[PDB]
Amino acid sequence: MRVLGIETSCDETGIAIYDDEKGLLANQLYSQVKLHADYGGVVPELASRDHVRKTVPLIQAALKESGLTAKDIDAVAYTAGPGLVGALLVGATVGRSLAFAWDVPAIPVHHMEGHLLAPMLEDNPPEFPFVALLVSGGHTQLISVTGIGQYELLGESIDDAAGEAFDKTAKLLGLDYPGGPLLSKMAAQGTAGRFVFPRPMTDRPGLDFSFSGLKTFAANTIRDNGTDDQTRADIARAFEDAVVDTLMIKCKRALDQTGFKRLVMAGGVSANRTLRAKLAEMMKKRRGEVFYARPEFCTDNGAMIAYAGMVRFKAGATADLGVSVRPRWPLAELPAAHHHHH
């Protein structure tokens, strides 16, 4: 069985082909970095425009890369949400009509479920149950995962997602949009403990997050200190260390509250090297295991969609001819289903 997965939820066009026996047969990506860099954020209208330009040639490149023809595709899966309504509609309209013309089932996919299942594309995938730390640009959530579509929300951000927080602070540091990975490289050149940022919501018990207060602490440290490369790197490190320590403390609490020995980390921020190292470090001390996707499957991609597409197709999540997108879609709303990973 093969599934063509389509990802167009934000500012990245991801196309992939997943074989349930052979694994991933193609993976294509177009990032809209250059388009949104000038504006310091994602302009939805420009994002939807670039998705139209890139969707079909990336479908074409993925069939060429895999040496596959139409008849080799068993189903078409597309991100139906969450994300930008305009961006989402491009992937979903192309995907639904392609499925119709190819005479194959169409699979609307939850983008956060794709992120959650991205470690299943690597060797030694996690077994159920596990705690999932979904940490991207749009979301920051803690989920108790007992199976496919059995997602209990343990905690979430009350304000800014860890992704937005990384991007907002990097903007203050003069870095271009999105600044999350650049702030990380800048942080590696900094002195440990030069500046100390707070670990928000770790004073009292609970699994909810807050990161807005960290931007404020960064702006106050920038204004009150030296303009040089070294002071900026120390600021970047104290910011990065504050986020990672907060995410680790919350994960510890989630694992202690659930009693689970498995931690899955996914979403764009799960590409962060300091976070991958700290969570791996914590899991070894607890005599548990950490699971993550390759850094390129942490950020928005088509591989996670063709995989979750394969899972939802075997579960029976098929769409009729209507095309529908959900800019907001809770992980709790997804139906319980079996996991046929073999």
Binding site: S48, T55, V56, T93, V94, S97, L98, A101, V323
Partner: protein, 229 residues
């Protein structure tokens, strides 16, 4: 041939099929329902006409202008179908489709097409049909403020037919233009009126492969101001 036409650029949702001699058409008002209605509409017209997607020679699509989302639904569906069934694509102007509609209804040969573009502007076009049925004026397509439409109207003469939502939004648009204006009785584009334009385009080999399909938005200043420097 066989040409399938699709349009979702405005409040309307339409499908049409030219089965060589035969025209099967379906037009409906779809506010807030385009994505729910367009594929069942494509399937119905294929069922009705007794044609299969593989037996279609070209896919004609509403290239725009109009609603940004609407134009994209059109190109998105059309791209999916053309990629899936390996079909060439024909991008048809929604302003020219209305020009054709006015000719179909009452023989209008001189059409001033105006779509409400929102933001106080209209998508404007001056279309003139020759003896062989070709609409001249594709070069006049622009997103304009009513004062600039007035200026454009000052450089014209004679009798013209008005078509589109821009005349509905601005009924005094042609006031003191110095032209003779009659209602074209066309408010929205219909996929049925894309077919004769597309038949002509196919014959002339003015068809593109699915990767070359392009929308015509006319309005491109859609972003908030760029960062300082």
């Amino acid at each position: 041939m066989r040409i399938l036409a699709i349009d979702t650029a405005t409040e309307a949702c339409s499908v049409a099929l030219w089965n060589d001699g035969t025209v099967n058409a379906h037009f409906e008002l779809c506010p807030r329902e385009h994505t729910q209605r367009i594929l069942p509409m494509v399937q119905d017209i294929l069922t009705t006409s007794g044609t299969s997607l593989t037996d279609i020679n070209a896919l004609a699509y509403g290239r725009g202008p109009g609603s940004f989302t609407g134009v994209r639904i059109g190109i998105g569906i059309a791209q999916g179908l053309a990629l899936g069934a390996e079909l060439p694509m024909i991008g048809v102007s929604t302003l020219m489709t209305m020009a054709q509609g006015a000719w179909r209804k009452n023989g209008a040969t001189r059409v001033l097409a105006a779509i409400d573009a929102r933001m106080g502007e209209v998508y404007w076009a001056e279309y003139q049909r020759d003896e062989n049925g070709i609409w001249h004026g594709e070069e006049t397509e622009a997103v304009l403020k009513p004062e600039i439409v007035h200026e454009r109207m000052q450089q014209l003469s004679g009798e013209w037919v008005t078509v589109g939502t821009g005349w509905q939004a601005w009924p005094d648009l042609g006031k003191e233009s110095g032209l003779v204006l009659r209602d074209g009785e066309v408010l929205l584009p219909a996929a049925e009126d894309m077919l004769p334009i597309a038949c002509q385009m196919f014959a002339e080999g003015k068809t593109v492969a699915v990767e070359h399909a392009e929308p015509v938005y006319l309005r491109n200043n859609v972003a908030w101001k760029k960062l300082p420097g």
